[PDB]
Design a protein around this ligand. Structure first.
Ligand SMILES: [Zn+2]
Lengths: 342, 104, 154, 131, 134, 194, 52
RNA sequence: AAACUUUCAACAACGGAUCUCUUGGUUCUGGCAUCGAUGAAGAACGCAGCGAAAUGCGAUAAGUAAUGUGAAUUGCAGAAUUCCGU
RNA sequence: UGAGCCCGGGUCGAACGGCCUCUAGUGCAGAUCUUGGUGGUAGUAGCAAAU
RNA sequence: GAGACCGAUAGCGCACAAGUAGAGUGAUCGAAAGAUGAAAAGCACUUUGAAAAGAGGGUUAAAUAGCACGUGAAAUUGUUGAAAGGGAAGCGCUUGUGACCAGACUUGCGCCCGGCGGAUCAUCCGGUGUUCUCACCGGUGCACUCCGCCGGGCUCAGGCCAG
């Protein structure tokens, strides 16, 4: 009953149902008997269990991932390219501003025209250190300011980052990340993402506030040049030197093009008798941290971001050359589940 | 609706327009009301021919026991009937206007 | 707008499901309500005592007067019974949940039953109808509250 | 000055719906009004403290009839052809896009109506703003 | 439209015949078109296929994949072509099902009967072409 | 037969009619000056008629239909191009529709002024949209939305966030990325790290 | 099956209504009224040559 | 305050309603005349590798001959069965 | 006014609607109504045939 | 071969094991019961555990599409949350409190300056189609006329509610 369909062979509902139930009960019975016998043999001999554990591992999309065979379009692992050369310059050339030391960040936060997500946007400004939220209109029938204009205004007043939180269904839906750069450098990359599952700390159970201390960023699993671009943009958005006295972590973990944002705080504590020791991946039971764990209490909002568009200047209206758009997410690109753009 | 004469135009256009979608073909001697007024709505677009016209004359005189009806109205233009010199002369003075002012 | 409370982290949580179980829905509901919201070891010892006739599950909603003993003082309810098969299958299901949590890598010491829901199942078409049940239970490690660092003025 | 014409103030004689008798106590009875036919029913006899009956007296003013609170009458629109039908009379009617209209046709209706000065009641159905 | 009384336009009867046709009728239904060079070499549009035809795919998720026909499953109205396979859960490769209407013939497995079939179809074609022309 | 065609078009059927529940019937004919189906403005029942229409090229024309050319549908309408000056265009409408019914004169004037105002507003909104740089794009399709919802749930389940956060935190503590005398951790437990 | 399906209509009325339909076809606006897209033909009866 | 009872929201159960589909049914119409002692209609028993059901067949038993088509069967086992060929 | 109609949000996957007419197996709370499903009684009566 | 028919409580009792299952001594009575998915690709493997059962993990565009499978109402039930309950509930008119949700006029025309460019501007040239007097193009220019665009300047008008 694995290669043949009872619904397309047996024409009777009740006969098909009875045959299926009898066969599935028989299959479960046989599977449990076989596993019990195999349990007995692996209990009497401990080595064929090890051969089982080295021969059969569960299937994984991450290790079934398909790569291409650096121009910001090919999804190829930068580290793989690096030690293949040993056995990116294109990114630096395309974005010299992003890639020497960056100035101390200053962020201006605003929302869409006549937005109603003021508290959520103020919370985003709370995540981003040295940030100020200012509303866009200040009333219904005001002058409508354009994102190009606000970018120029903030550049002339000395900001370095402009974050725009667009809304839908009175909920934050998109984040446009503009970079103002320094001195005479024109306003640069605009990484637009999609704020999906947004949740405030107030609604988060067991939460807390963030403190004024500068937290350290954990940018996890960014491998393709686009992932490195996004990671460096967030690194520019956050301060370089965290105040380690204020034990706060801001983590962006990337898996299958789904960037996950979380904010927690440290407690490095000894392991309780009922707890485990943090086991290593492929190399379990890390050596050196043998009796100590880390306590995490989420003190920040839950959002998931997914990059859709990065542009050269401040949006499509502002990108003018023959390479106006640098990347655009497409369902044709995401058709195959093993194709990750990151 | 293509109308022809089987006596002079023949029966090849029947198939020629039979294949074309939407268009129909009907002889002049067997005009069909279902095709003349589809769905009860008047004004069917009909592509005629000269033989068809000269045979409409013949068949509509040939129908026995039927005559072309005499209508109860000669000048169909009611605007002509009302806005004419004789009527406007014979009418009396108006007693008011189209929109009457409110008195109290 | 308003935001509903977000779910606890799946890798801080453990889930267990038992469908089409052949135990009375009312008895399972009463036992689940009795053991709801408790410590894992407390619940297991409670159910073992229920089997050993030591501690009684109080009936509140589906209550039929059967026993009026001194074991009902600890709940304040005058009607208490001992659902044997309920206690046994629920022990099995929390053991399955504990195994699942151990596989996920949670601290075995601090599992607490946040959620246990008992629903009715399709009736066993044999007029005498049986009442099977579905039981789903969700467990977590105890919520952790941690220190603040003193805010620095600047 | 972009609004509806000067209009007589909208006065609603009754705002609450007329509820079917005993529809509260029986769920099988829908809340839609059904005139009772019992010879001794209290609601039909119009006793005090019973559900009122619909009447042409409750019927509303003709000048303010079918008018939205903004003062426009809803026009069901399916395309830019319907918008161009509303061309001459936007101060009288407001566009209401049909539910089965696709996203791009919704966008075209919104764009043409904005160019045309026609208010749309549902301009945020399946669209979003992009910079 | 239909004029001959023998032919029927009933969708019910048409579907019944299509789903209960015998194997020869199934072959006739699962005839497939020939490629260009084949069409200008044989003056034929489409012939029924066999197990030894090199075929190219023009429709589906596996478009532009070339291979030799592996089998013709007449019961499911499908054909199996080489190297177009999917892996099951266990990993075993089952050949993916594709339709004669969605494939196009690139090479023919020629025998006496096939040559006779193409000759008959062709000869009819130039017969009627000449009849129309002159 | 104007009265007869009016009766047939109003009492029986009209392919250009869009009757609404709001108490007015709309006429879909492209040459109707008003958007309402009524005797005064029906292009089919009024043999002698006039209309104002705008070409794609921004040019405005006035169209004339007369009963002597009631037939010849290719030739029903005379097209006369109006000037860009509003006052002079109204005057030219006056001469070219002199002796016409007052209703048609009034509605031709109203349609001319409405088209020119619509042109003004279109240019204003084009400038405004240009100066803002914002564009209305469609939202995500429901099938795609289901796709990212399911793949997000699977991705989070495989991601196991807080475990990885602790992963990296302990990795950095072991590699000593917090420096000597870390302010993150207690000196006790630090000696355990040694 | 013995329900009345076919309706008896006087031949005089049928001929009268066919004549009325022909007059309606001769009337030009009625083509638009019935929905026929009639805008490029140079004549609403459109008699074409029997030779062609 | 809890328990219990009532109302509502989210979610989850039960159940198969609504929309959709139809190798079906019903009615009408057209062409033709054909069961059996040379064993009829019908009943039973057997025939397959795995056959429960259904179908086919009759110890030559999912059948043989002959003709036609022209490279299969197919749920699994199978042939050294057959491809310019009675 | 009303029987009802339109839209917004979610689900959902292949057809559907407005108007003019034509047609009818066309509008439900009852009929100790039909079928199906589901409750209180009740985890009660009692372990009785059936199961 | 067809239909202004019925569309799984309908249509023949039977769309599927249907005169089948089943009942009766017997003549006879006689049901219920359709839909995974495009393609089984029908969930590999690890791990619980005696099961028509789970946790991972995988297939699919989607598995809260998993042979209990197109969608999935109401009756009834459970968990969470809010409120209320001194011997009935439920309903009407009218506020108040709390919770959630929505978001008011869609908010512009006109005049006057300076520049720029296009045009029924030019008794300008050429071409085309035509209702033969109306249109549409190609080519020069800006003396006059009219439009816009830019940068100034001034004015007015507006939706609702109170005094
Ligand atoms: Zn009209």
């Amino acid at each position: 009953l694995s290669r043949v369909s009872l619904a397309r062979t047996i024409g009777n509902k009740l006969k098909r149902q009875q045959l299926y139930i009898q066969a599935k009960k028989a299959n479960s019975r046989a599977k449990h008997e076989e596993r019990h016998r195999r349990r007995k043999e692996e209990a009497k001999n401990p080595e064929l269990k090890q051969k089982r554990l080295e021969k059969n591992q569960p299937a994984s999309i991450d290790k079934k991932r398909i790569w291409d065979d650096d121009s910001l379009g090919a999804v190829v692992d930068v580290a793989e390219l690096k030690r293949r050369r040993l056995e990116p310059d294109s990114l630096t050339s395309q974005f010299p501003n992003l890639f020497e030391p960056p100035p101390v960040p200053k962020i201006l936060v605003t929302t869409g025209i006549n937005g109603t997500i003021h508290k959520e946007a103020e919370e985003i400004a709370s995540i981003f250190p040295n940030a100020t939220y200012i509303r866009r209109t200040a009333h219904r029938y005001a002058y409508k300011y354009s994102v190009r204009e606000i970018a120029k205004f903030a550049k002339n007043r000395g900001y370095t980052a402009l974050l725009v939180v667009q809304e839908d269904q009175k909920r934050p839906s998109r984040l446009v990340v503009v970079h103002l750069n320094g001195e005479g450098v024109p306003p640069g990359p605009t990484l637009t993402y999609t704020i999906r599952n947004y949740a405030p700390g107030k609604a988060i159970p067991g939460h807390g506030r963030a403190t004024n201390h500068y937290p350290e960023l954990l940018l996890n699993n960014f491998k393709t040049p686009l992932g490195l671009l996004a990671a460096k943009s967030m690194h520019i958005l956050f301060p370089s030197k965290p105040e380690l006295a204020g034990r706060q972590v801001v983590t962006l973990h990337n898996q299958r093009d789904y960037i996950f944002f979380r904010r927690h705080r440290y407690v490095f504590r000894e392991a309780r008798p009922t707890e485990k020791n943090v086991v290593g991946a492929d190399g379990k039971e890390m050596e050196g941290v043998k009796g100590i764990r880390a306590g995490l209490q989420e003190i920040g909002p839950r959002m998931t971001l997914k990059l859709r568009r990065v542009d050269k200047g401040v949006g499509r209206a502002g990108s003018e050359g023959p390479d106006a758009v640098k990347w655009e997410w497409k369902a044709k690109m995401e058709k195959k589940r093993t194709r990750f753009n990151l | 609706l293509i109308v022809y004469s089987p006596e002079h135009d023949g029966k090849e256009l029947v198939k020629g327009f039979r294949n074309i979608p939407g268009v129909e073909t009907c002889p002049v001697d067997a005009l069909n009301l279902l095709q003349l007024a589809p769905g009860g709505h008047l004004g069917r677009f009909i592509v005629w021919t000269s033989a068809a016209i000269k045979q409409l004359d013949a068949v509509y005189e040939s129908k026995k026991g039927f005559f072309l009806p005499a209508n109860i109205v000669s000048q169909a233009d009611l605007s002509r009937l009302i806005n004419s010199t004789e009527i406007q002369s014979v009418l009396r003075a108006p007693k008011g206007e189209a929109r009457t002012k409110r008195a109290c | 707008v308003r935001y509903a409370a977000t779910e606890i982290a799946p890798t801080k949580s453990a889930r267990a499901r038992g469908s089409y179980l052949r135990v009375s829905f009312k008895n399972t509901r009463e036992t689940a309500q009795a053991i709801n919201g408790w410590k894992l070891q407390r619940a297991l010892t409670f159910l073992q005592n229920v089997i050993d006739k030591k501690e009684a599950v109080p009936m509140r909603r589906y209550a039929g007067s059967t026993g009026r003993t001194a074991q009902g003082k600890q709940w304040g309810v005058s009607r208490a019974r001992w659902p044997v098969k309920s206690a046994q299958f629920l022990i099995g299901l929390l053991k399955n949940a504990e195994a699942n949590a151990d596989a996920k890598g949670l601290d075995t010491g601090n599992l607490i039953i946040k959620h246990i829901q008992v629903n009715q199942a399709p009736k066993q078409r044999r007029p005498y109808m049986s009442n099977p049940c579905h039981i789903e239970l969700i467990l977590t490690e105890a919520e952790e509250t941690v220190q603040k660092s003193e805010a620095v003025v600047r | 000055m972009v609004a509806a014409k000067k209009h007589v103030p909208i006065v609603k004689k009754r705002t609450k719906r007329f509820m079917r008798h005993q529809s509260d106590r029986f769920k099988c009875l829908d809340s839609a009004w059904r005139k009772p036919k019992g010879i001794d029913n209290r609601v039909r006899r119009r006793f005090k403290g019973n559900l009122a009956m619909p009447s042409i007296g409750y019927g509303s003013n003709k000048k303010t009839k079918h008018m939205m609170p903004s003062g426009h009458k809803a026009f069901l629109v399916h395309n830019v052809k319907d918008v161009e039908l509303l061309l001459m009379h936007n101060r009288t009617y407001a566009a209401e896009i049909a539910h089965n209209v696709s996203s791009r046709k919704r966008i075209d209706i919104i764009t043409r109506a904005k160019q045309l000065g026609v208010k749309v009641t549902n301009a945020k159905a399946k669209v979003t703003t992009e910079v | 439209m239909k004029v001959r009384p023998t032919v029927s336009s009933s969708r019910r009867k048409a579907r019944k015949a299509h789903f209960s046709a015998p194997s020869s009728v199934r072959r006739v239904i699962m005839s497939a078109p020939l490629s260009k060079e084949l069409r200008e070499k044989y003056n034929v549009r489409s012939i029924p296929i066999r197990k030894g035809d090199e075929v190219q795919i023009v429709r589906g998720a596996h478009k532009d994949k070339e291979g030799k026909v592996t089998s013709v499953y007449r019961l499911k109205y499908v054909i199996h072509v080489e190297r177009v396979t999917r892996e099951k859960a266990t990993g075993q490769t089952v050949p993916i099902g594709i339709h004669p209407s969605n494939v196009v013939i690139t090479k023919l497995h020629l025998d006496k009967d096939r040559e006779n079939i193409l000759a008959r179809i062709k000869a009819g074609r130039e017969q009627v072409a000449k009849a129309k022309g002159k | 037969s104007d009265e007869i065609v009016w009766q047939i078009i109003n009492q029986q059927f009209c392919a250009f009619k869009l009757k609404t529940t709001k108490g007015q019937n709309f006429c879909r004919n492209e040459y109707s000056v008003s958007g309402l189906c009524n005797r005064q403005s029906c292009p089919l029942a009024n043999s002698r008629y006039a209309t104002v229409r705008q070409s794609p090229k921004g040019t405005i024309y006035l169209y004339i239909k007369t009963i002597e050319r009631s037939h010849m549908p290719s030739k029903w309408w005379e097209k006369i191009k109006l000037s860009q000056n509003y006052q002079k265009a109204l005057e030219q409408i006056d001469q070219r529709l002199q002796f016409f019914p007052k209703f048609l004169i009034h509605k031709c004037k109203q349609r001319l002024t409405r088209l020119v105002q619509v042109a003004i507003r279109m240019r204003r909104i084009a400038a405004e949209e240009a100066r803002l740089g914002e564009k209305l794009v469609p939202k995500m399709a429901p099938k795609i939305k289901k796709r990212e919802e399911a793949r997000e749930r699977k991705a989070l389940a495989a991601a196991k966030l807080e475990r990885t956060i602790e992963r990296e935190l302990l990795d950095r503590l072991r590699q000593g990325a917090y420096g000597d005398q870390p302010l993150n951790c207690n000196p006790q437990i630090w000696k355990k790290v040694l | 099956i013995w329900r009345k399906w076919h309706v008896k209509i006087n031949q005089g009325q049928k001929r009268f209504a066919t004549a009325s339909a022909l007059a309606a076809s001769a009337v030009a606006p009625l083509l638009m009224a019935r929905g026929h897209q009639v805008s490029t033909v140079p004549e609403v009866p459109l008699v074409v040559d029997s030779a062609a």
